[PDB]
Amino acid sequence: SIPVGISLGLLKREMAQGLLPRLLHGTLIMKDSNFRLVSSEQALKELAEHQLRFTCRVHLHDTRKEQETALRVYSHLKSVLKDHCVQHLPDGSVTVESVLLQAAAPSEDPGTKVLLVSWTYQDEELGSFLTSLLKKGLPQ
Amino acid sequence: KSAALHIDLCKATSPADALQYLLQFARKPVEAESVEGVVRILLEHYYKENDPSVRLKIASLLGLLSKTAGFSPDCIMDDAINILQNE
Amino acid sequence: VVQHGVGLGEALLEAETIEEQESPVNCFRKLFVCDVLPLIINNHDVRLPANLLYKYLNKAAEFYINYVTRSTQIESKRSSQKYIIEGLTEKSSQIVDPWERLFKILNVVGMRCEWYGDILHRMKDLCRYMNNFDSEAHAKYKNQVVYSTMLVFFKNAFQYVNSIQPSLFQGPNAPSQVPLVLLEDVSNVYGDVEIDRNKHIHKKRKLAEGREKTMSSDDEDCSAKGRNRHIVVNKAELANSTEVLESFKLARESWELLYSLEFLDKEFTRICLAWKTDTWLWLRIFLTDMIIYQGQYKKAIASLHHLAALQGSISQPQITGQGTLEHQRALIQLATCHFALGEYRMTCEKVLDLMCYMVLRKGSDLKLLPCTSKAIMPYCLHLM
């Protein structure tokens, strides 16, 4: 068995969040015969947490209000996805698991409106289904 | 006598003098009305204090005070669990 | 709901006022905002006027200010401001995301007239044409856009107050956030290019104060030093203050936009006078800092003095020109205002009274630091 190290912050958060059968996603800096499996954010000093932020764009033809669109998307996802997150967000946005949805500025074409959805590799399996669900789009 | 505590403890130092004085108090028994007075002021100092060890001593003698023979503990128990939630 | 209509909200507001909470911050008002008023706004049958929506927004702002800066009385990520409301427990008078409640109140106000982070570009685009529109026919949507911009500015001001003085809102039994203070033009004595010319000795008094209207005459024309300058906070002293500096910059930008409109400034001044928004340490300190940065040093100092006197009358301990557990922010703010106004002799007197309280791309810069004695000793040394 290979003895390696953990950051106590990551371990404490994992126990605290898990005790109320999920996964533990981590990153190991396998240095010269000395290993260290920490969270990604902990690697920032040793640069090397230079973040790789993803974003998948969703083509929606609606031009409705941001708060109303976010509330309807949240309700639609809570209907479809079985009790992932039932919560009223402060900023009038959407996030299921650890994805990030942003009603960004559209392209230079006045006839095109696009919604953007950022996430991580942890939540991509649900984010792809979320984007495929919203591929049909809100009622135009 | 509880007004003596009301003067000295808020006019003491945080780290050890309060702890040593609190330890001194634990060696004398208390009467039930004075028990109510002391649990009230100790809850007040528990509110104001931020050190862990001093609060540990506060709670442990609060437990020693509830062990006293004749009084009703439910009324102070209400506020006791009220602060237990945010600890 | 046709049985009472607007009666329920008015009765709840009256009940909130009767509990020594005349300003709409009591738990009755909180319950009305969370449930009664939101249901009335959501209900198509109930159609309130614009004044009711504005009052609901004011009540939400009072509740948020109380939950963000008022003391709790005992006798990827998300965040909400919760505290002990008047007449009900904190968790027993629960409101889901009061900032979202205020945003939804603004949205309901816009919906009455029909016609943000994710929409930050969209919010900026709306704010661009929010002060040069046509009359009422074209201003039906412009009023909604102005209200949305004001709500965004209020959110930015709340974030700045959260990074400026939210330590006095919560106790020590659980983890919390620390307060912070601003600084005058004294940061131009650290960098290589930044040479000692930010305030000098007599130059600051000559070029800053001018003996303006010392009273708190808000909702008026301020200076225009922010047009081609700002508080450029160097990363060499605030390298870990990304949230604090970001909130400060957002508050400065909103305050620059705030003075452009007359209705928004009048509404903010009316709220401050009626609901005593200056009696909350965080919001008053943040607004005073934004006004001072915008070029309203006299009115900002007046508001800061009113807030300091209100805190002194309050149960928080106070000291004569020296820092305390809660008076450290007040002392730092007074010293910073004295440095900004260039009163060299008064600054020296304050330093002498605060020596025991002390801790042992062009023009001036800024920084981000805590509201404790750290913000007073090094800034005073730089001024000297």
From Swiss-Prot, chain A:
Q: Where do the annotations place 1D-myo-inositol hexakisphosphate binding?
A: 12
Provide the effect of residue 58 to M: In NEDMLOB; uncertain significance; may affect function; the orthologous mutation in Ints11-deficient Drosophila is unable to rescue locomotor defects
Impact upon substituting residue 121 to C: In NEDMLOB; uncertain significance
Positions of crosslink type Glycyl lysine isopeptide (Lys-Gly) (interchain with G-Cter in SUMO): 12
What does the record say mutating residue 94 to E does?
In NEDMLOB; uncertain significance
Post-translation: what modifications? Sumoylated; sumoylation regulates its subcellular location and is required for integrator complex integrity.
Q: Where, subcellularly, is it found?
A: Nucleus; Cytoplasm
What is the stated purpose of this protein? RNA endonuclease component of the integrator complex, a multiprotein complex that terminates RNA polymerase II (Pol II) transcription in the promoter-proximal region of genes.
Q: Which disease is it linked to?
A: Neurodevelopmental disorder with motor and language delay, ocular defects, and brain abnormalities: An autosomal recessive disorder apparent from infancy or early childhood, and characterized by global developmental delay, intellectual disability, motor and speech impairment, and brain abnormalities. Specifically, brain imaging shows progressive cortical atrophy, cortical gyral simplification, and delayed myelination affecting cerebrum and cerebellum. Ocular defects can include optic atrophy, nystagmus, strabismus, and retinal dystrophy.
User: Subunit comment for this entry?
Assistant: Component of the Integrator complex, composed of core subunits INTS1, INTS2, INTS3, INTS4, INTS5, INTS6, INTS7, INTS8, INTS9/RC74, INTS10, INTS11/CPSF3L, INTS12, INTS13, INTS14 and INTS15. The core complex associates with protein phosphatase 2A subunits PPP2CA and PPP2R1A, to form the Integrator-PP2A (INTAC) complex. INTS11 is part of the RNA endonuclease subcomplex, composed of INTS4, INTS9, INTS11 and inositol hexakisphosphate (InsP6). Interacts with WDR73; interaction is required for the assembly of the RNA endonuclease subcomplex in the cytoplasm.
Record's protein name: Integrator complex subunit 11
From Swiss-Prot, chain B:
Give the coiled coil ranges. Answer: none
**Where does the record place it?**
Nucleus; Cytoplasm
Q: Where does the record place its HEAT repeats?
A: 32-71
Family membership, please give it.
Belongs to the Integrator subunit 4 family.
Per UniProt, subunit arrangement is: Component of the Integrator complex, composed of core subunits INTS1, INTS2, INTS3, INTS4, INTS5, INTS6, INTS7, INTS8, INTS9/RC74, INTS10, INTS11/CPSF3L, INTS12, INTS13, INTS14 and INTS15. The core complex associates with protein phosphatase 2A subunits PPP2CA and PPP2R1A, to form the Integrator-PP2A (INTAC) complex. INTS4 is part of the RNA endonuclease subcomplex, composed of INTS4, INTS9, INTS11 and inositol hexakisphosphate (InsP6). Interacts with BRAT1; interaction is required for the assembly of the RNA endonuclease subcomplex.
Q: Per its database record, what is this protein's job? A: Component of the integrator complex, a multiprotein complex that terminates RNA polymerase II (Pol II) transcription in the promoter-proximal region of genes.
The protein's name: Integrator complex subunit 4
Which organism's genome codes for this protein? Homo sapiens
Q: What is the lineage of its organism?
A: Eukaryota, Metazoa, Chordata, Craniata, Vertebrata
Swiss-Prot record, chain C:
Please, one GO biological process term?
snRNA processing
The listed locations are: Nucleus
Phosphoserine occurs at which residues?
216-217
Provide this UniProt record's keywords sorted from A to Z: Isopeptide bond, Nucleus, Phosphoprotein, Ubl conjugation
Q: Where is this cross-link: Glycyl lysine isopeptide (Lys-Gly) (interchain with G-Cter in SUMO2)?
A: 299
* Ranges that cross the membrane: none
GO cellular-component term (any):
integrator complex
Q: How does it assemble?
A: Component of the Integrator complex, composed of core subunits INTS1, INTS2, INTS3, INTS4, INTS5, INTS6, INTS7, INTS8, INTS9/RC74, INTS10, INTS11/CPSF3L, INTS12, INTS13, INTS14 and INTS15. The core complex associates with protein phosphatase 2A subunits PPP2CA and PPP2R1A, to form the Integrator-PP2A (INTAC) complex. INTS10 is part of the tail subcomplex, composed of INTS10, INTS13, INTS14 and INTS15.
Q: Which family does it belong to?
A: Belongs to the Integrator subunit 10 family.
Q: What does this protein do?
A: Component of the integrator complex, a multiprotein complex that terminates RNA polymerase II (Pol II) transcription in the promoter-proximal region of genes.
**What is the name of this protein?**
Integrator complex subunit 10
Record the organism.
Homo sapiens (Human)
